[PDB]
Every structure is written in C-alpha cells, then in structure tokens.
Subunit: 444 residues, 4 copies
Amino acid sequence: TRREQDSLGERDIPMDAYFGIQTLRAVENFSLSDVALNHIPALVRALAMVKKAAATANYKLRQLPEPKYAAIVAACDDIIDGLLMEQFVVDVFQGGAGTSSNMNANEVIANRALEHLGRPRGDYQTIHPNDDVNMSQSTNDVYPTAVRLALLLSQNQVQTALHRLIAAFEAKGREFATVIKIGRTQLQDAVPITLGQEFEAFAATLREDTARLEEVAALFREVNLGGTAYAEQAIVELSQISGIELKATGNLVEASWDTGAFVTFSGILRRIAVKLSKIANDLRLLSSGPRSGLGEIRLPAVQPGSSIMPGKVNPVIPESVNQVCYQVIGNDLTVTMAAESGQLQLNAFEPLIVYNILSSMRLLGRAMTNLAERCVDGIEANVERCRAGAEESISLATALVPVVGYARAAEIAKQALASGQTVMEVAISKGLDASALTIMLDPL
Amino acid sequence: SMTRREQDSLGERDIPMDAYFGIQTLRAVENFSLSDVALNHIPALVRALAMVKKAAATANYKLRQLPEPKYAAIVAACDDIIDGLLMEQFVVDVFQGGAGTSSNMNANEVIANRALEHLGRPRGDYQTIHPNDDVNMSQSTNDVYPTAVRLALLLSQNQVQTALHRLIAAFEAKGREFATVIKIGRTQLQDAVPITLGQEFEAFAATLREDTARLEEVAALFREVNLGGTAHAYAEQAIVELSQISGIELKATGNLVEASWDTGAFVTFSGILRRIAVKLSKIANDLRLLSSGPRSGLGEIRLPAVQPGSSIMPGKVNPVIPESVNQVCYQVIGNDLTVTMAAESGQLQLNAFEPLIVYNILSSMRLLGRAMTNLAERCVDGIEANVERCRAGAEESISLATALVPVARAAEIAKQALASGQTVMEVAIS
Amino acid sequence: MTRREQDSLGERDIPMDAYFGIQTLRAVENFSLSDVALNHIPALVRALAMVKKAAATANYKLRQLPEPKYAAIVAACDDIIDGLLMEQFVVDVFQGGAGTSSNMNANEVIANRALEHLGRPRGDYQTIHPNDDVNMSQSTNDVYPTAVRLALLLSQNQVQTALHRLIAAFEAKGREFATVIKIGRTQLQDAVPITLGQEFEAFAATLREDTARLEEVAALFREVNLGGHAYAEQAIVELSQISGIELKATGNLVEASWDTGAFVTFSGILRRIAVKLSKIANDLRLLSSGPRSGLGEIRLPAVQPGSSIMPGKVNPVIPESVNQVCYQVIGNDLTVTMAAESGQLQLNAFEPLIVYNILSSMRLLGRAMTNLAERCVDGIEANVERCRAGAEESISLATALVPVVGYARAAEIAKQALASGQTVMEVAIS
Amino acid sequence: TRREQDSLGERDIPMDAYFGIQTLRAVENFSLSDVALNHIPALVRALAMVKKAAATANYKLRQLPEPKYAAIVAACDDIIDGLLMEQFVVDVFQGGAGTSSNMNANEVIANRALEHLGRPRGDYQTIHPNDDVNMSQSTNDVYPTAVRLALLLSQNQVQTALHRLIAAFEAKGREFATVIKIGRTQLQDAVPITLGQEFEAFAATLREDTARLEEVAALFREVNLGGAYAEQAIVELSQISGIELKATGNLVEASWDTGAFVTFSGILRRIAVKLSKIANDLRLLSSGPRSGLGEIRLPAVQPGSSIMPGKVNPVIPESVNQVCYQVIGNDLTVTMAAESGQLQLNAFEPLIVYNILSSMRLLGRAMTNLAERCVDGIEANVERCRAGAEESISLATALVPVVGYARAAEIAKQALASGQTVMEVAISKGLDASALTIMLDPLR
Ligand SMILES: [Cl-]
Ligand SMILES: [Cl-]
Ligand SMILES: [Cl-]
Ligand SMILES: [Cl-]
C-alpha cells in the first residue's frame, strides 16, 4: 500500500489502485448493492469527456499549465477509449449527489496522467485530483453534465432496437396480409380482420415512439457546465470530444435543481414498456394451446421440451419482455420519487436517477432486440385455425341484413350459435344466398 | 339573503344566516376548493369526529367543570351528527391543507351552532357555546384529527369484511357446483394437466380466506390513539368515553412523540387493500379469460348477462362485472401509491397529509367492498359451466399420454395425436 | 309513480319523471361502486352529447333519420351540451362494459328529452328509440373512445389557464424580489449567495416548459375512429363543426382499436407537472418555516386563522393542499398505467377508468395552481433582513479572498469565522 | 469445447463449463440485464438444497440408485458451501417461469456429481440433468419452493440490520434525554420537546417492524414441493436448510398464489417509508451549519474543502433515501408481476424473487450503514437546541394565570417583533419568569 491524505485524514491505498483516498472512503460509505459505477460505463466515459473539455478550456484560458493539460487529456483519452473501467468502484447508490463519482474520475485521471509523465502513483504534487483535474469545476455542474451526456451517448442502442422490432413487426404484417382471423374485443368474438393487420398495428404503435424518444432526449443537450467565459469554452470542446452537439442552459438558478427532462424521458421508457407489455401479452394469448387455447400463431421454440409433451411451447421470450416492462415501470416510479424530493438549489439524487434510466434503456433495448430476433422473425400462422375463427364469426349474420332483414338475420345468427354451424351453413340450408358473407371473409 | 357577522383571529366575515358552519369553515371553503369532493362524501370521518367531540365533552364535564347546560347541548348536537344529520354542513374539500384543522373546525362550528339551536339560541351566539373554547375545549387538531381518522377506519372495517365473506361464500358454492366438471389446466397459457373447474373456483375462495384474518389484525393497530396528547387523567378519561361511544375498545399510545408523525398503520392497511386488489384483479382476469368466445375463445364458463346484448349478436357476453372489478383494483393500487407518498413526506413532529391519506383509504375500502359484493351477487352466483366444452379441453390433453407409460413408446402416441388432431384415447385403441 | 320499460332481459319500473331508461337503471345497480357518477365528469357528458348530435346530423343528411326526429334529437343534444340534465347522468364512473353504459345513459336521456320536445311522454320509444334512432349507425367502440378524446380536448383550456396564472404569479415575484440577496442551499447546506427573485423566476421557468408540451400532446387526441363510409366521413365533419376542433379520422382502425398511448403520454405530462409543483410547494413550506427556529426567509399570506397568543405561526396550508393534489395525480397516473397495460387484442376495456382519472387529475391540478397563485404566491413577502443575514453569514464568501491573501490565509479566515460565530467580513475587517 | 444435445439439437459448450446446453440456450435467449443468478446467491443455495432434498427422498424411496444419490448430494453440498457460484449464469430476467434456473442447477449439479465420480463433464448417461438430478421434480414445484426458501434464508441479515439501527437510535435517545429543543409541526415552531424523545421515536417506529417482518416471512414456510415422496422431501429440506417447512394444503390455489410476496414486499416498502422519513429528518436537523436548523451534527465521512469548513453534506442519509426510493419502485414491480398471474401459474416469479432479494440486501445494508457511519456518531448542538426552545412563542401560554390571556398575547406579539424571547419580554415588564422555566424543563 501507499499512504494518502485528504481533509479528513490518512488511509492506506493499494499501490495497484488508480483510485485514491476519496474513492476508498466512498467504497466503505456507500457499500449497498454490489453494483458499481463500472456497470454503468456510459457515465464513466461521459465523466472522462467532461474532464477533457475542462482541461482544454483551462489550458486555452491560460489558467492551467501546459505539461498538466497534456498529461490529463491523455488520461481522459485512455478512459474514453475504454481503459481503467475497473478503477471505477463507487456504488451506484452513493450519497453525496455525484461527488463520489466526480472524485473517482478526478483521482483515476490524476493517477493515470502521472503514469503518462513517468511519475509514480499518489504524486499529487505533480498532478492533483482536485487542484488540477478538478480546476474551475465543481460537482454540481460536472456531474449533472456527465449524466446528461451518458444518456445522450446511450440513445442509439435504444433507437436501433426499437427500429429493429418495428421492422420485424412490419415484415410479419406483410407475410400475414392474407391470413383471415377473428377480431376480439373484451375477449368476446368480434368481426373478422387479418393477422397481418394485427401485426402491422404492433409496428404502428411503436413507430409513434421513435421520433418522440429522439425529441425528448434532445432536452438533455441543454447543459449547466461551467455553472460553478470558461463556460462557453468547455461546452464547445465537450461537443467535439463527445461527438454530440451541446448548448448552455438559459437559466442557471432553474437548472440547478431541474430534473424535468429525466422525468419526461423516463416517462417515454415507461410508455414504450406499457405498449411492449401489451404486445407480449397478445403474443402469449395468440400462441396459447396448442389445442385448448387460441392456437392462432406458433412462436419459435427456443427452449427444449419433453418428447412425451410435444406441441407445448412456453412463450418464454414474450415472458422475459413482460418482466423487463414491469421493471421499467417500477424504475420510473423510483425516478419520480427522487425527482419530487429535490430541495431548493439541488436535487441530491441524480446518482439514483441516472442509474435507473440507463438500466431501463439497456433492459428495453435488449428486450426489443431479443423479441424481434428470437421470436417475431420466426412466428408462423396457423392459417386453418385462424380461418375457422373468422368463418365461425356470428358477426357474419349482419351481412345478411340488406337481403333478409334484421329479425331474420338475427334468427339465422341464433340458429347458428345453437347448432354449432357457420352462419353460411345455416343460410345455405334456408335456400338463401350467402354471397355477402364471402365478402366479409376477403382479406383483400 | 340574511347573514350574521363572525370574527376569528384573521378578522370579521359575513356568514349565511342559516349555515351551521362558521367563519373558519367559510375560509376553508374559499381556500381549498380543489376537487368538488367535500367531507360529507366520507361520512365515516364526519361521524368519527362527532364521536371524538362527544367523548371530549363528556370528559370535560366530568373532570374540567364544563357547565352541565353546555355539556348537554353539545352532546345532543354530536348525537345528531353521529346519527346522520347535518351531513350537508360538512362542506370542506377532502384535499384541504392544514393537516386536518379545517375538518376539526368544521365540526367545532357545526356542533356549536346545533347545540345553540337545542338551547333555543341563535346561530353565532358563541358567548353561550363557543366553537374553540367550549366544543374544542382541552383539544387540538393534532390529537383530535388522527384519533378521528383511526376511528373512521375502524368503523368502516365491517363493510369490507362482510363483502369479503360474501364473495368467499359465492366462490365456495360454485366450487361445489363445479366439482365434477373436468377441464384442462393451463400454465403459461399452455395446455397442461386436467383439473376440475370446482377446484379452480375453490382456489379463488381459498386465497381470499387468507385476507379476512390479516385485515382484522392490521385494522386492530388503529385502536391505539393519541387523544388527549394536547392536554394524563383527562386523556385517559376521554379515551374511556370514546371507547364507550364507539363500541370499540381503544387504548392510549405509550409514546406521544412517536405517535405525532406516525403513519405506519395507514401504510400497512393500505397495503392489505392493495394485496386484496391484486388477487381480485387476477381472479377477474381469469373469469374474463375463461368466458372468452363463445366460439373462438376458451368458452369454459358463461357469466350471467346483466346488461342487454344485441339480438343479431347472440352468445356475445361482455364480462362487464369483472371489468368493473379490474378498474376498482387498478384504482386501489394507484391510491396505495398516493398513500405511500403522503406517508413518506412527514416532517419532524407531524405528517401534514392525513386528510389525503384518510380520503384515499376510506375510498379504497368502499370501492373494494362494493366490487366484491357486486362480483358475488351479480356475476359469481349465476356462473354457468359449459360442461362439454370443459370436457373436450381435458380429453384433448397431450399430457394423457404420460399415463400410458406401462406400454417412451407413449411419446410416439403423443406425437401422432398432436399432428393427427385426435385425442390420446383415440390413438391408443390403435 | 313509475313507468314500465322493457329491454332484451325483461321489464323494470323506472321513476316516472326520469329522463334515463331501463338500460341506465340496470347500470346503476350493476356498477354501484364509488358513489361517483358520470355527472362528476361533465366534460364527458357534454362530449357524448356532441357525438350524438354529429351522428344525428350525419344520419339526417344521408336520409336515414326523419326530419322531426332529427330536429328533436339535435335540440335534446344542445340542451345537454348547455349543462341541462346533468342529474340524469347517473352511471358510476367505475362502470364495466368499456363505455357501453355511458353510451346508453346518453341514448336514453336524449330519446326522452327529444320526446318531450315533440310533446310525447317518457318511454314513447315508438316515436324516438334510444337504440334505433339516437344510437343509429353508432357503436360503443367508436362513439365512446371518440367522446373520451373530445372530453380531454375540451378540458385543456382549464389546465393551460391555471398554469399561465401560476407562471405569471411567480414571474411577478421574481421581479419584486430581484434584489433580495439570500443564501443558496445545496443538500440543505449553506452554499453560495443567490437572489430570492432568481428562486421565484426559476419556478416560473420550469412551468413555462410544460405549457407547450401540454398543447403538443393534447393535439394527438384529434385522431378519432368515429364511424369505424359515407356516414363516417360526415359524422367527423359534423363533430368538428360542433366542437370547434379540427378532428381527423384515424388511418389505422386495427391499431386505434386498443391504443392508449396518447392517454399514457398525457397522464405522464400531468405527472411531471405534479412532480415539479410538489417540489416547489415543498420549497415554499421550507422557506417559510419558523418564524424564529426555521429558515424564516419568506412569509406566506395567513389565510386560515390562528390563536392570537400564538402569533407568527403560519401553517403553510395552500402549499400543503397542493402537495396533496400532486400525490393524488401521481397515484392516478399509476392507475392509468395499469389500465393502459391491460389492453387485450382489439380493445382496451378500461377507458372509463382512464378518462375518469385523467379528467379528475386535470381538474385537481388546474385548481391547485390557481389557488397556489391567487391565495399564496401573489401575497408572499420577503423577510429582507433575515435573507441578507444568511447571505452575510456565508462561509463561501471567504473564497473571494483567495486572490487577495492566498489559499491558506483565506481558509484560516473561513475557519476562524466558523469557530467564532462572526461573519467573513467581520473576521477580515480584523 | 464439448458437444451436447437436447430435444432441439446440438451446441458446443466450453470444456470448463459446469453448466450444459440448456443453460447455454438460456444465456442466448435472455441476455437482458447483465445480472446473472449468481448476483442472488441465496436462490442458488436454495435450489441446491431443494435438489439435495429431492435426491435424498428419491434415494430413501429406492427410486434413485445409491451411487447417483451419493454423487448428487456431494455436488449439492459443494454449492451450498459456496463453490461454483460463477457457473450460475442465467439472467435474472429470464422467461420460462423458473425453468432456466431449475435447469442451470440440474446441469451444474450433474456435472459436479460426475466430477465426484471421476467422470468427464457431459457424461449424462452416468448422471443425467433431467432423469436423475430432476427426478420426481418439475419446475413448478421446485422453483417456487426454492424462491420461498431463498427469502427465508435471507431474513436474518435484514433482522440483524434492523436491530442494529434500532439499538443505535435507542442509545442516542438516552444520550439526548436532557437536550431540550423546539418541536416543529408543519415546519412551524411548536412546543419544546427533547432531542432524546425524538431519537427514541425513530427507534420505536422501527421496533414495530421487527415482529411483523418475521410473522410475514413465516408465510413462505408453506411450500408446494412435490405437488409420500413429497412429505419426505419437505422433512429433508427442513433439515438441510435448518428452516422448518410444511406442505401447502391446497395445490390448485398454491400453483398461482403470489399473496405472500406481495405482503412481504409491502413490509419492505413500509420500512423504506419510515426510513426515508427518518433520513429526511436527519438531513433537515443537520442543515447549516449557520443558515439551517443546525441542531445536530452528523459525522463527516466524506472529505471537505479547507475553505468551506462547516459544510457537512449528509451523504449517509442521502444514500438511505436513494435505497428507499429503489425499494418503493421495486415494490411496484412486484405488484405488477403478481397481478399478471394467469390461471394455474404466475409466470413471473423470477422477476419477483430478484426484486425482493435485491430490496432485502439494499435495506439491510442501508440500515447497517446508517447506524454505524452516521447515527452512532451524531452529536447535539445543545446550545442551539436550547436557543430554539427558549425562543418558542408557545412559552407565552405559561403566563396566562399570572397576567390573563390578553396580556399574555401582547407579550407574544412583542417577542415576535423585537426578536426577543418571551422571558426577555416578561422580565422587561417586571413579571415573574417562574412559570416559563417549568415548560423548558426536560423532566415533564
Ligand atoms: Cl451504461
Ligand atoms: Cl366513508
Ligand atoms: Cl369534467
Ligand atoms: Cl441473494
């Protein structure tokens, strides 16, 4: 061990560690979940990018000296490129409003930067975690800026998955365009529709979230960096470094506690979860059986069965999706509570908030990808079973009204229900023309 | 048109002459018009408040020399409210701020003015019966209100218990009716092994039986009250009087500084209502699923029709009672979240949000009792089994091959039946 | 006296005078759950009457509905649109049937009022038939979800006005307190100085954002499935003229059939406003705490009386009422989420619960913000001296001395000030 | 790698893996969260105990040959003892209602049993994951039994944490018995109490939870294991786990009941509610040091800035609040899973058990950390506490018998306007202080 010192006193730190005393304290202070900052690596990379922006802004503004600027920029590039992730060890449930994550960055960046200067660990007389790495910065504009960037960095995985699942539902809508089946309202047999229309409707509801997701995420572009001249500078560098176009917030006093964008964005994750769960529930119900459920579609069998129980297909991929959806809805309540609990000039609970949102983005992204790839793409229609449902439709009797009158049609409907026959069968047996029914049964 | 002029610490105001409420209730009416839902929409809380006032008046008469003429006028007024009169005078919004103060004050003024009337004196004659000095003697909001909240919940228990027992009985009787009705069990919505529809309905009963005892045990936490914590002889006596008036044995909290902010019992009780709603909604869901069809769904049961259907669409029975049950359960779950937030938001020596809490829990209690009542009476009691459709499900079971094991080769009969579309009774002859 | 009426289930007696019929009476018995009737959400009743007017006009214009019956029906619709006959809308908001009983409650009331217009008695359904005439060309699954969306559209102005009123109130105080120096607090610890005016402008700013978002999300409700073709296209055009909103037919009926996305998104914007509002109210309760042993930075107008012996005690009742409304709206949002998630195939059966929760939450929030603005924010006063003292006792001020005397020296001045009660300017002046 | 086969086909498995083909399919089917079964080791140990119980009953009933029993039992013992955790790889968000957890155990146990027999992995004709390890078992009795057992095995850690925090608050209630301060109701100065009473109230509310937690956890003791064999398996499982279990009476009810998970999650929620409130109070009482309430000092556990002395961010209570919001969110996740049961099974117990075990761990550590790193070291600002009590306007009431109500109120208003105490005003008008200092006496 090497021995380090901060304002509280002395501790012994593994020489193998790139983190320093303040991080070690945080590890014992907030050991709560065995979930560390490295399990949310987007926040780590965002933290390294903000630090680079700030070193550059200090350098160009003559504030920070030139050998320091350059060793620290190197160090940040190292992390941005995915090195030293295991050095990010503070619990996601950390108190301190982001301070412990800021410090974990500052200290790791300092040590790494020393190691670029051929100097040993803890040599903070050369590169200081606070004095240098943190120069012109405080946690209350750094951490909120890095949270927003982490979410901006994470948008693409969600968008890609959503588009992929939309495409999968679209393809099946085209494949099943000719597959007639019975619509069901309140789970009672309704009027004929196509299975293709049902799948196209899964696509269409989700298509509505793509643009909305993008537009709410754009709210995160408005950042408070340099909120304590230097500010305008750091923001410019952060835009180039991150590859995302950022802008200074119009109101700093408003921004200091504002969690509004976090609430809106979580609310769209929630909205996608609600739709996705309903769709998964439909898939489980449509594939019920194989003999005594609806038996309208077959899902790909992705888990092995028993030779003596063939035809049993547990709809495990939709089940996993349902679970992710319930989790996302609970995590949204978690975010609501943290957001509601802000006080005066700060919300202290952004670490909780960013952990729940990034987690929910991961969960939903993966669930949609799995749902498309390991289920939707391989769904097959039981064409004959779908047709049987539509042809047994009591609603077919309504197409007889023009020709025979309401009362007689209703009497033909009653006779069909009683005798187990199709409306067409009952119409035929009466010496009637059932041509209008044929039209109700035409997907085209 | 006539008014009388009243005064409080904020100033003077004109009050409609015949109103039994006074200046402070009038201010609360102006201040908290938020939902159009007034205190008289939760009459249990109004009755409970009147019980508390009566208990306090009796203790003041016994121990603190409240004059007999005031005492008897005041008690007569509380009795009237307890018995359902003057409910329309309880006009403050259930969303009122003030942690219950405006509810206390609505009671104080109405009781004062109704007492005055019993003494043949005019409204507003507060030198004779004073809302604060007489009706509120020895009390403050901070012991009167939480005590009245606890009492209101206790007085409302029996309506939920009765309904739960009614629904349980309904389910038990169909479990007997359906004991010989064989059908296919379904797991993860896949055809599984045969069960009876009787067993299915008895399981709906069984899960609800677990709730009756838990409900009484949690409700009994409400018996510990902080009444008289404002003013120990007075306290002890007011509680003895309140137990007598209410017919429920109550006790003093042993720790008043703890009792001051404590909402634990509310959260636990809201929690059991929530648990009951989760089970009931699942059961409603099952009923809607089992009655799907009549041709292209499950079609295993038929629910009684309670609203007319279309003559051209015979057989269609929308499961409207279970649907109304689902909506009530989603309301209760949401209300439980409202309670959780109010509860978590207490500060130091008070939770300011008990008006919201008591409003939500009483509402949820009424909603649940009536949903369970309606489910039993307007749905469960008339449920029919489509016995031959149930049978065909069970006889179509591939699980039946497993029985054949004394003949592996059984797996080949199962494979043949699946693809052939025939039963495992049909394939095994051959 | 009662009149006798009949439907497909049988006969019932109806109060002679009632404008509702047998179908509505059945619904009263079937769904008696909450004691909250359709008349408690009058925007839905008005919207139903608009949809019934538009359908009658379409039907008339296409030769399906005779002139005298059309004209009497439209006049009956107009009466209800004005608020007449609200008391005849008696069906519980927790009704099952996905909106059927609401549709029928309208059909029967409009039939009987049109019959009155033609000088006929109640129940003369031979002249005007609730189903055949008033519900001509219509079904629940198009009429009700259309009327839900329209009710939501007609209810926008109230929330928008409330929100603008509140923003205006905070903006005014932001200017008035523009020079009131005070101490910022982060994590509840003394931070760096700010102005009280900035604190209030920020409340305005955060709520300004919600205004455009509210309008944007509300536009989504214009896509309706009414009439799901000569009839369909005519009905929407008539409904757009009647309602003064430009409505568009949905392009995907199979998708529209179960879609609740817009309800969830709307409820979500109410939830966000509530989150923000509650935080603001909590801020107001904290800043006005005391008056001597709290923060004491501002005084809320006293709106509810106190005891003259306890002066300076101002319970923050308006913000408290606001917190309660916010907690309710968040719970109601969970209720909407559960209902939206529980859609099945070609219908969501739970729109009656969704529309009730969203309309209630809108009314509560609108009233909460109007009250917060008028009865609290407008009268707020700064304690200028107590504010300045907090800013004067800020240890953070020592940071401005770093360039003057260097770190170590500035930090010992900081340290000396802490350990000695005195301010940074006091210790530096020595 | 080695090649295995199941009823769907063949996969190659890394040669050093103890899991088999069915687990490998599960990793592919349900990669969603990057959180594997090994992050909830109590369920791993429960499953191993259930498998040990089943092998032993099977053996004693002469259905499982001696050498297979001995090897299986040895393998289960290794897992109960904490070996092979890393082989439990299936995502917590797995579909299949538990199947993949059951199969993960069956495969790992079979292979480890093979190692005890000196046989290679994959030799399933010697020890078969399904025919031998899963003999007389199905997912739908084994999984929900293991879930109930996991929650029972995790009770002690939460009870220990709760008792620790109660004891920390009790000791401070004793320490602060003579510290008078001003009560606050609706955030307004009310009447004096003691700081000691305030801390004893924190203890007292949490004490009500200890007994109820146990009585609710007792509900998990009723298991559906086996539903002769069944009774015997439960007797064994009780012995193996050291927790007394009993067979459920109704198997058709038990098949879908999630009643106990909802009640238990509700007690975790109730605890979170009380704990967050308490943490809110600690953060408020320690606000300042100068322009807050400044009544107590929390231990400084996070390094400060030398030029901001006096700033003590309440980081431990803040981490507690975050945990409490997570627990409330998780509780909603459980409610949705529980409500979404259908017919003879609830498909979502994997999600339920994960949320509940995570919530148990979070709360247990939060409460431990609050006691040890915060409450034990809290100190009173005795003088500031006393000043708050002495400036209480309520004091004017004690003068009513001396000067009458009216004159008492004039002094109250004057105190308020001058900023003086009621005693200072009283003395200034030549009135006796006697009555006042009685209402400021900690003995009441
Ligand atoms: Cl991440
Ligand atoms: Cl009530
Ligand atoms: Cl309305
Ligand atoms: Cl665990």
